[PDB]
Design an enzyme around this catalytic site. Structure first.
Site, short mmCIF file in Angstrom:
data_model
loop_
_atom_site.label_atom_id
_atom_site.label_comp_id
_atom_site.label_asym_id
_atom_site.label_seq_id
_atom_site.Cartn_x
_atom_site.Cartn_y
_atom_site.Cartn_z
N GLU A 1 0.88 -1.20 0.00
CA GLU A 1 0.00 0.00 0.00
C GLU A 1 0.90 1.24 0.00
O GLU A 1 0.67 2.17 -0.81
CB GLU A 1 -0.95 0.01 1.19
N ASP B 1 -9.52 3.61 14.61
CA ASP B 1 -10.06 2.30 15.03
C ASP B 1 -8.97 1.57 15.79
O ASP B 1 -8.12 1.00 15.14
CB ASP B 1 -10.43 1.48 13.81
N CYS C 1 -7.66 8.99 6.66
CA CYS C 1 -7.54 8.96 8.15
C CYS C 1 -6.21 9.63 8.50
O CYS C 1 -6.15 10.39 9.49
CB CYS C 1 -7.70 7.56 8.74
N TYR D 1 -4.32 9.37 -1.23
CA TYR D 1 -2.92 9.41 -0.74
C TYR D 1 -1.96 9.66 -1.92
O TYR D 1 -1.47 10.80 -2.10
CB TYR D 1 -2.66 8.15 0.09
N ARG E 1 -6.83 11.47 12.09
CA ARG E 1 -8.12 12.11 12.42
C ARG E 1 -9.06 11.06 13.03
O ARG E 1 -9.82 11.46 13.97
CB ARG E 1 -8.75 12.79 11.20
N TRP F 1 -8.59 -1.66 0.31
CA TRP F 1 -9.40 -0.59 -0.33
C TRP F 1 -10.55 -1.20 -1.14
O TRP F 1 -11.22 -0.44 -1.89
CB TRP F 1 -8.52 0.30 -1.23
O1 LIG Z 1 -6.08 3.88 7.96
C1 LIG Z 1 -7.19 3.85 8.51
C2 LIG Z 1 -8.47 3.96 7.86
C3 LIG Z 1 -9.59 3.91 8.59
N1 LIG Z 1 -9.56 3.79 9.96
C4 LIG Z 1 -10.84 3.66 10.69
C5 LIG Z 1 -11.33 4.88 11.44
C6 LIG Z 1 -12.84 4.62 11.41
O2 LIG Z 1 -13.20 3.49 12.22
C7 LIG Z 1 -12.97 4.28 9.93
C8 LIG Z 1 -12.89 5.44 8.96
O3 LIG Z 1 -14.22 6.00 8.71
P1 LIG Z 1 -14.47 7.55 8.96
O4 LIG Z 1 -13.66 7.80 10.22
O5 LIG Z 1 -13.97 8.33 7.77
O6 LIG Z 1 -15.96 7.75 9.16
O7 LIG Z 1 -11.86 3.38 9.74
C9 LIG Z 1 -8.36 3.65 10.66
O8 LIG Z 1 -8.26 3.52 11.88
N2 LIG Z 1 -7.24 3.69 9.88
#
Ligand SMILES: O=c1ccn([C@H]2C[C@H](O)[C@@H](COP(=O)(O)O)O2)c(=O)[nH]1
Ligand SMILES: NC(=O)C1=CN([C@@H]2O[C@H](COP(=O)(O)OP(=O)(O)OC[C@H]3O[C@@H](n4cnc5c(N)ncnc54)[C@H](OP(=O)(O)O)[C@@H]3O)[C@@H](O)[C@H]2O)C=CC1
Ligand SMILES: NC(=O)C1=CN([C@@H]2O[C@H](COP(=O)(O)OP(=O)(O)OC[C@H]3O[C@@H](n4cnc5c(N)ncnc54)[C@H](OP(=O)(O)O)[C@@H]3O)[C@@H](O)[C@H]2O)C=CC1
Ligand SMILES: CC1(C)N=C(N)N=C(N)N1OCCCN(Cc1ccccc1)c1ccc(Cl)cc1
Ligand SMILES: CC1(C)N=C(N)N=C(N)N1OCCCN(Cc1ccccc1)c1ccc(Cl)cc1
Ligand SMILES: O=c1ccn([C@H]2C[C@H](O)[C@@H](COP(=O)(O)O)O2)c(=O)[nH]1
Lengths: 536, 529
Positions: free
Chosen positions: B305, B436, B413, B353, B433, B327
């Site tokens: 990636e 998870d 994110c 990205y 931002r 993705w």
């Molecule tokens: O690299 C990444 C991409 C996604 N997320 C998680 C954050 C959220 O659970 C969700 C992204 O959805 P939004 O935050 O855009 O609603 O996936 C991550 O932790 N890391």
């Protein structure tokens, strides 16, 4: 071997400011009572704290107290309680239904009144040496002087107080009685609590101290710290003796210390570097500060800060403006140096008019992605109105993890007078409350940051208001955290100062659109501060 | 009991020997009468500080419990082989009451003014005599073995040497229900291997400024108001650790914080999360590679990636033909249509990205267009800043193009990276931002750690810290049981990353230039059901 250490006699009081540019010292908080009651209605957080100090006991630490007291004297139940001691007028201010103070051994000083004048279960005494007698005959944990200004006066001039649990009420009321001026040779502050809001006033709790002028897992700690570099071949050439006050406080819980401790960290551990100017800095990388905007406005107290200039900057941003003249004509000089013929030419902006700062914060907030022309153009419905969008996500999609305002437009950087330091704001909404993170790539700890904390704290209040939300946390992430060399001496002064309870910020509540605020819509109440420091 | 009474401690260092992992991974003690590794010198240093150190005002409470049972130094106990294996110049180990196990050789035989004993028991008496702080079994396989059998070891001071060495002698399988780990140190590099220091304990089946602490806590959350509906019980191994200094605890402590103090919210998808706002983790890339060890993580997909971003691709199919499916969900007709991208080809992920990294401000067209020398190549730029202007505070790599968010399959994110250079070392902050903590963050740490190494190497710098700033940090409500299982696992010492040292252009990395070394991990965890 002093009487107050053996019998553990403490004072606990709460002092507002009294009806007196304004000088501030620790005598600013000195107002005790008015016409035989307290100068304020309720401050329930002061009562809760009062309750906690005067009722807290620890049975395990009793045996060493009993031995200690029995030793000093050359020597019933066991439901351990503290003693409290009251002037008679103190006692006659207490609502009937709360007398005597629950779960405390109540003692009252009086000449006019004797035990037969009371229904209650109180020790009545004629005189102070009568408290010392009683305390040698009672099982009690600690003894608290609850005051009366008269009681406080006689107890300090007899050097009978070990510590003062002193509550600073950061508002003004009518007072007819006052706490005596604490002698700084006799008492020094050792701990300063967090800052709270209760009943429309900020307050904090400080502790003055009488001056002298399994434990296998104790050792695992020392094993585990075997690699530690600092024998104290001072990493950086700043000395201990210089931060004598800063280092002598035990509990540094005032949120101002979140900012003061990073300056200590940068000074003691910073990397020496030679930035864009040649000035020279100590620098570190990555910090978080969190301020509780529901409990205070974090305007730093260890130096005087004026916010007219930065409030007028924030209104200039919000209007989308990039015209440096607009600030100059309100006698705000924040952007003056960045708009000179010289500064612009040296940025290769040879076709940019003086004080035309190009596509800076205001432009990016209202019009991100529009082709910037000049500071006078009508850019209406050009580019993304990020600001409008983020107010919309807070109102209608509060749980979004995509509520960000970004000043860092990579395409426009080279056309800006300088690339922005406040990269981005994210917002978080839980249970009617708005929190905000601002990420700053570049952080002048002595000059810039204190204003920055203020700008974004004000901004968070504004977004909270226009969204029908209460403000919660303003969260400040510092990337490149630097102290300019020639700030160091000033910062050593500032660090040896003890913060005052934060002030509060009031926004005129009628403003409901982010665009509709003016300078008069902003009030900083109860700013108590040390005098100004010129950072050079 | 004897061992608790007499402060009898074992200190050892166990490497891995020449697939599934447990504590008995780390057993290797010795080879051909010497140690199995040449010289690991952070361990030699640890071994000093631990075996010299004594506390003045505490032997009062051992004069107590040992003689109420019937300058001050430390006792050490080593077998003959353990005693011979030592060179001549360090005998008898300075500042320590030396001692030996030997049925054979006596005091007229041997050199300086040590002590000797011949029965295991005969030690008990010798300690019953002497004045000493704590007693250390430096061992040999045989000495250790018969001290664990006889239940004489209070604590084991065990070094995990996280490389592989030829061994003839081993440590006893540490009796899982008879000992437990109460402390785990920072992770360290020393002599091209990672190592940490854990502490096994025997299981059983001016104090005014301390009251001031209680007054200052007068307004804290009590027990009903330590918010959330998880239990103490269930994290008992997590809760029993006194010292939690392994850097994986930076990740684990955030999960604990979110579970216990997190705000219940119901996000986008109707799913349910516990959420907090604003954290900062920092990992010393110079000392280890922070790939979570409390469960199994795979890196080929997130390495591909990263290579995919660096090439500026936005073409989801390129990843799908390498069976990297990170993705896939974000490229379907359905998901594009719900982003109102009705005119976007399936797996055309838009100006994400890669496009922002190499073409920021270029008008996106489709995933197949040639964009050479269009828009701002931030990646070429931030590399030229590190090399020409390392003291710059403008070395930001930013993916959050406000103009382009709606055209993206989804907003990033990972908002930005910022770099710092000091004394030929490179640190990187990444601001995330949306976090998870259960699925994403573990991978996200690895991605940006690797990136930092890549950027450092093409710039001829040593990587220093990866600093991960979390914004909206969330636990999905249905990861909770899995993370509870995860919190109660003791991290293993981290692996290392070897980049192929030949690659000096960021664009010239391939999947085979990336090797993870000595990855010791607890078992796979399905985070859901
Ligand atoms: O690299 C990444 C991409 C996604 N997320 C998680 C954050 C959220 O659970 C969700 C992204 O959805 P939004 O935050 O855009 O609603 O996936 C991550 O932790 N890391
Ligand atoms: N802000 C705060 O923290 C506090 C404020 N207050 C406020 O303080 C004010 C009351 O204080 P102030 O007017 O000084 O009065 P005090 O409470 O100090 O009461 C003084 C009375 O106590 C008796 N007294 C004091 N010392 C002795 C002694 N050594 N021997 C015998 N009697 C003694 C006398 O009673 P008698 O006259 O019968 O002989 C004296 O008149 C009120 O306004 C009250 O609400 C009170 C406590 C704390
Ligand atoms: N990884 C680590 O931390 C450490 C590794 N080592 C390694 O371990 C290896 C050698 O140790 P290991 O084989 O045990 O040998 P040891 O060093 O334990 O020495 C063994 C000898 O101690 C004596 N002994 C053992 N039990 C008794 C008893 N019950 N009563 C009387 N004497 C007893 C005997 O000596 P005698 O011959 O006198 O009868 C025995 O042969 C080497 O490789 C060494 O470097 C050593 C220390 C630490
Ligand atoms: C209460 C106060 C002001 N706070 C601090 N920190 N230190 C003190 N010494 N103050 O206490 C005064 C003690 C008497 N008091 C004063 C009081 C309170 C309300 C109305 C009138 C008077 C009181 C009343 C009821 C209870 Cl339950 C406990 C103490
Ligand atoms: C030293 C070692 C392996 N490390 C830990 N953590 N725990 C142990 N029990 N080990 O101790 C073995 C003691 C022998 N030895 C180790 C050794 C050195 C060289 C060659 C072989 C073995 C030694 C030599 C000099 C000093 Cl100052 C201290 C210990
Ligand atoms: O709001 C601001 C604006 C500027 N700076 C400081 C940070 C640096 O000392 C300098 C910006 O220089 P660069 O980091 O852009 O080089 O100004 C702040 O602290 N806050």
């Amino acid at each position: 071997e002093q009487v107050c250490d053996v019998f553990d006699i403490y004072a606990i009081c709460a002092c507002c400011k009294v009806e007196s540019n304004e000088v501030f010292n620790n005598y600013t908080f000195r107002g005790l009572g008015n016409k035989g009651v307290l100068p304020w209605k309720c401050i329930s957080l002061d009562m809760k704290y009062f309750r906690a100090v005067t009722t807290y006991v620890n049975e395990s630490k009793y045996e060493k107290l009993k031995y200690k007291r029995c030793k000093y004297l050359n020597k019933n139940s066991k439901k351990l309680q503290n003693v409290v001691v009251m002037g008679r007028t103190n006692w006659e201010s207490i609502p009937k239904k709360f007398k005597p103070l629950s779960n405390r051994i109540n003692v009252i000083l009086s000449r006019t009144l004797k035990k037969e004048d009371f229904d209650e279960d109180v020790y009545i005494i004629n005189k102070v040496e009568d408290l010392i007698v009683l305390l040698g005959k009672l099982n009690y944990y600690k003894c608290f002087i609850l005051g009366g200004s008269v009681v406080y006066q006689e107890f300090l001039e007899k050097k009978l107080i070990k510590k003062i649990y002193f509550t600073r009420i950061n508002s003004t009321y009518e007072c007819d009685v006052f706490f005596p001026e604490i002698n700084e040779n006799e008492y020094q502050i050792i701990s300063v609590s967090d800052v709270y809001t209760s009943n429309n006033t900020t307050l904090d709790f400080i502790i003055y101290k009488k001056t002298n002028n399994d434990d296998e897992e104790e050792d695992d700690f020392v094993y585990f710290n075997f690699n530690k570099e600092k024998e104290e071949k001072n990493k950086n050439s700043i000395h201990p003796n210089d931060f004598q006050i800063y280092n002598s406080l035990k509990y540094k819980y005032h949120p101002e210390y979140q900012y003061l401790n990073i300056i200590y960290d940068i000074m003691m551990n910073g990397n020496k570097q030679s930035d864009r100017t040649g000035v020279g800095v100590l620098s570190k990388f990555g910090y978080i500060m969190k301020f509780d905007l529901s409990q205070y406005f974090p305007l730093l107290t260890t130096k005087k800060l004026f916010l007219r200039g930065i409030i007028e900057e924030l209104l200039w941003f919000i209007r989308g403006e990039t015209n440096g003249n607009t600030l100059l004509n309100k006698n705000v000089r924040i952007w003056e140096a960045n708009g000179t013929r010289e500064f612009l030419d040296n940025r290769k902006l040879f076709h940019r008019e003086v004080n035309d700062l190009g596509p800076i914060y205001g432009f990016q907030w209202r019009h991100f992605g529009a082709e910037y022309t000049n500071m006078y153009d009508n850019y209406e419905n050009k580019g993304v109105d990020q600001l409008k969008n983020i107010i919309n996500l807070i109102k209608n999609d509060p749980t979004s993890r995509r509520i960000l305002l970004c000043a860092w437009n990579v395409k426009d950087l080279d056309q800006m007078a300088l690339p922005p330091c406040h990269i981005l704001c994210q917002f978080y909404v839980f249970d009617g409350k708005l929190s905000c993170i601002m990420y700053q790539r570049s952080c002048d700890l002595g000059l810039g940051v204190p204003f920055n904390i203020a700008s974004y704290s004000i901004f968070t209040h504004m977004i909270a208001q226009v969204c029908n939300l209460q403000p919660a946390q303003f969260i400040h992430v510092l990337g490149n955290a630097h102290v300019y060399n020639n700030h160091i001496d000033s910062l050593k002064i500032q660090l040896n100062r003890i913060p005052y309870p934060f002030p509060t910020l009031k926004l005129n509540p009628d403003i409901k659109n982010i665009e509709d605020f003016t300078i008069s819509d902003f009030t900083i109440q109860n700013y108590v501060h040390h005098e100004k420091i010129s950072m050079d």
